[PDB]
């Protein structure tokens, strides 16, 4: 029944996706174009 403990690791994979947020940080730079 502890085998379900491995399913919790799937949540750790979601933390790896958070690295994609760094790519969205470039979208904030596009917002500065509005200053023009």
UniProtKB/Swiss-Prot annotation:
Which domain of life does the UniProt lineage start with? Eukaryota
Residues the record lists as Methionine amide modifications? 36
* The protein's name: Neuropeptide K
Task: Record the organism.
Answer: Homo sapiens (Human)
């Amino acid at each position: 029944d502890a085998d379900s403990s491995i399913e919790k690791q799937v949540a750790l994979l979601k933390a790896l996706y958070g690295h994609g947020q760094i790519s969205h940080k470039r979208h904030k730079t596009d917002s500065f174009v509005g200053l023009m």
